[model samples]
Target chain A: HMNDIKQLLWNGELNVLVSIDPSFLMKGSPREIAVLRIRVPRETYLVNYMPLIWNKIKSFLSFDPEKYFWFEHNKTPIPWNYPVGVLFDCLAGKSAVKDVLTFLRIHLVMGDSLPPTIIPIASSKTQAEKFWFHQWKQVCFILNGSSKAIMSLSVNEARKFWGSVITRNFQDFIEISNKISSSRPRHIPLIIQTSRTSGTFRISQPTISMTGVNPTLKDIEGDILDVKEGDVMVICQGIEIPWHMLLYDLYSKLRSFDGFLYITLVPIK
Target chain B: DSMDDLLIRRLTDRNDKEAHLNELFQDNSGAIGGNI
Candidate 1:
């Protein structure tokens, strides 16, 4: 039966393979992820409907639906790699495309407390404003500082806050807050000073104080200030530093310093 | 049949089967993936 199914699938006679196994979706399942298989070709063209269908039909099944369903091709799981036929198929409706986009947007904003509501076809201006306001709040919560802090700052101040926080320019740091806002969103840009002597840095709101053996460099060579055998400093713009640059800097520091270095970058957090 | 006809037939058939199963089961709980 399994070989027969596989043959059908390979022959393009059975294009759709729907799995309703919740266990497979969850961890530690030895068997294939899909439970239910359908030999419908056109149904397979629709993107991401299997999981939605599984969520709906899972209750009817005898087993506990701990996880959602996924589609499989041959024996291997299809995962996110949509088949070429499915991608090019004109049968895939506009609503399917919209649903996929909405699905993606929901995943992006799923960290926040807001519920992802489908927009009505004919919404009022107030309703649209409300939707946008919710979206803005979610974006602010993700990128800007704390919700309260972001609300407190003016629109211009908020823009400058994000710009300064992300860019970490010396002038911006001085004008805005010397001490990087601990309240700023996502700690993706923080590079900790890991030296043994590097003591606890304190923040006085607008100012930051780094005590004990502060070595200031006159010039940065190759974007790195080689302080000692193990300590190096580098400045960065936002969280968009290239991987190769970081690797090169770390490699050079390791080679010169004889070991790992206590590296510090601008805009800590 | 045309692709549209095939799609409609398949959809109608699936819906009918789903409805029939729900009716027979008497216990149905409704509930709620991927990049482009």
Candidate 2:
């Protein structure tokens, strides 16, 4: 598969991920051996405000009107605390008598230093969903190498360069949860930053030329090295859409030719 | 060391029922569950 992908890229053919995990699901390996699931009321977003915010901020950032759209995008925060509470209740009521007793000392009553910093609290009954909208328009006129072109690729071809996998034991837990229960608390997702290389500036033409037996400098050549072009950006998944596809249409075109393309993958802590 | 000693003292403090309740309430519910 790597060879196939490498050849495709070498020949400037597009490669993409067809089944990349959505942005909202966790990315990378889980550090903990076990995690408590917390259940909470799923609040569907009343409105999607992110596109609006992005649009509003676009004008300030050399905006693109064609890309901004606010129609029916919705997101919600996953409830993690609820499961923690359930697990705590079960554990405190049963085994680990000594540990439970210690925890009970610090809890099971109200006083100074009673609460911990990262407690599971369901008291926040309302997470107000904000709503907003925006539009941006821009035109940049640049005079360059007597040539202007734009190319696009698809997710199917782009997935070749980058592959996805469930890192560790948490995935096993999730699989187990899926098999025996429909009531398990939900897992919150990790954030994925866009992966790509930055553009650089340089100028040069081949200094010498050679023929079959003898050669002379005849032609001029100047080109950017490792310039990846594409609109493959990052998308964070919230409630409504827990799974978001990583589109590589723009990325493939940008990275078609490579010297050393840069792509960053940072897992949300 | 101080923190550990303090925690041990607090956890074993039989007279501080209210302190125990507060600690349980404040702790990460997940971490608390791990004790069980």
Candidate 3:
């Protein structure tokens, strides 16, 4: 058999043995062993060196051929063997874990810090969602106005802010505003300003005092009162009159107001 | 290093040379079938 194999090798009739371990570190350490695969005319063989090593420091491994079966890429089991050199060629060109990491770094524009968990690339939807979620969290921290405060946010807390606050409110705000703006004639846009304050609902630029007139606050129940110039209001459900009307009213007030509206909805709950 | 080197090394291991030889036989069988 040895002579027959040697003859086959000389005749170029033997497929090259392909190592399954991508690192290729099997040759160096006695602790490390190689996993190899070979395809025969009738079947494919999965060869592991560990059994052989345990049998003896230099022993060759053997396994029952009956225990193995060939499965196609589509996962269909077949009695006939796959084509020769297929496994070898595929293994030779296969990308290692390090290669995947580099590919991710280049494509995703990632910095030095990579997430410790294995990224799932097989499912594109999940991958995209994870990537966008990561970016959104980063942006949210920046938008949160304080770097120190952001650093203290736990993963769960960040996720909460992402789902409930950022995604819910911001997405709705864009959709609603887009619907409103698309229908209206393109004219001078509204300029609105927002700030955090303690007392009295008052517009500073046009200096409109709500001292006598009662205006309904959108989210919170009852009429708007004791709201200061800089106080952040939480507009619940949808952006209605107070959200829109107050902005329109504010827009009319400022003579030199740009199209930019600064309405800060900082939900403190 | 190379497959040739690995084969030679395996041959030197007396107890398990048969196993390595079996793998080579399988490889050859596959190639021969591929040629036809």
Candidate 4:
């Protein structure tokens, strides 16, 4: 049953329309305009797609493919570390995108060029794999009450886990991840993404309770994220998640491949 | 009956969207990819 649920979850994809920031183009070039319409899996990182982007649009846009890049929408830098779907929910959810497309700019400028909200220090695929481990360790800590579940993995096992994510293989990922997953979790690893201001997004990671009754999102709406029920609407995947949904159940079903339940709340008019 | 049901039905049932994007993807596909 979970295999089917996990398959469905992994199979989810989002379509995005991307255009290069004209600033990256060199002099003596055509005032070119190109829009990249692509489909991406919800569970993956944003920057990882750059090589594919860099390949086709090489002539239309100019950038040092060697230099690390970050993404921007409406002039504010979007964190590349978060999964694509969570970024969409935090930035473009509650707005009309399903009918059209989510738009963003691929900025070739390096880390210091942008705001401090996100620094893509992972810079390379290998480093991003390590960063994935960093996030997974937090889930390990939450599920097994210690990071040792991940920490104890052999070097080959660690590579195997990351390989599954790299290839988007549910079976291989579950084989290794099931060892860390607990029937009774110590705490739920939940990250709430919200926009505090027009350009600034505040992402919060608060301790979650797994004792007594398993709380629904309503129970902890304000308890952890300081969000009142009606003040904002919660989004997971691409739709508004019910307030009555249990936290652990949400995590089990909608959690990212990195192992955190990423929920973004959007303001309601 | 389950939360996954809501997501599976609405989100995963998206072959048409994926197909539409893949058709357009060949034109100028740049957005997201890989483990990095």
TM-score of each: 0.18, 0.13, 0.16, 0.81
Error of 3 at A91 (Å): 50
Local accuracy of candidate 4 as per-residue lDDT tens digits, A82-199:
8876776676656515655343334444444546666653535576677888999989988778888888889998898888765777788888888777577778888887762244
> Which number leads on DockQ?
4
Runs in model 3 deviating more than 4 A are A1-122, A128-142, A159-269, B1-36
Residues A1-269, model 2: lDDT tens digits: 32233222222100110111122123442322112111111111111112222322333333233221111101211122222112222222211145333231111111223232322222232211101000000000011111111012133322221111011122332232122222211211111222211222121221221112221101111111124531122121110111121112111111111111112222222
A1-269: candidate 1 lDDT, tens digit per residue: 32222222222212233434443244444333333332222112223233344454444544553222233333322322222222212112121123111111001001122222322212131332233334335433432433454365565653563343223232542333212233323411112322111233311111111222222222123234223432222321101122234332222211110011223332323
DockQ values of all predictions? 0.03, 0.02, 0.04, 0.39
lDDT of 3 by residue, A121-240 (tens): 221223332443443333323323223344455666544433321222334323322222322122222212222122222222222223334332342222232244313343211121
Question: Whose lDDT is greatest here?
Answer: 4
Q: Who wins the TM-score comparison?
A: 4
Q: What is the interface RMSD of candidate 1, in Å?
A: 20.1
Better of 2 and 4 by TM-score: 4
Prediction 1 global C-alpha lDDT: 0.27
TM-score of candidate 3's chain B against its reference? 0.32
In candidate 3, the residue pairs with backbone N, CA or C atoms under 3 Å apart (3 or more residues apart, or in different chains) clash, namely A41-B30, A192-A262, A195-A230, A196-A230, A197-A230, A197-A231, A199-A228, A200-A226, A200-A227, A201-A227
Better of 3 and 4 by lDDT: 4
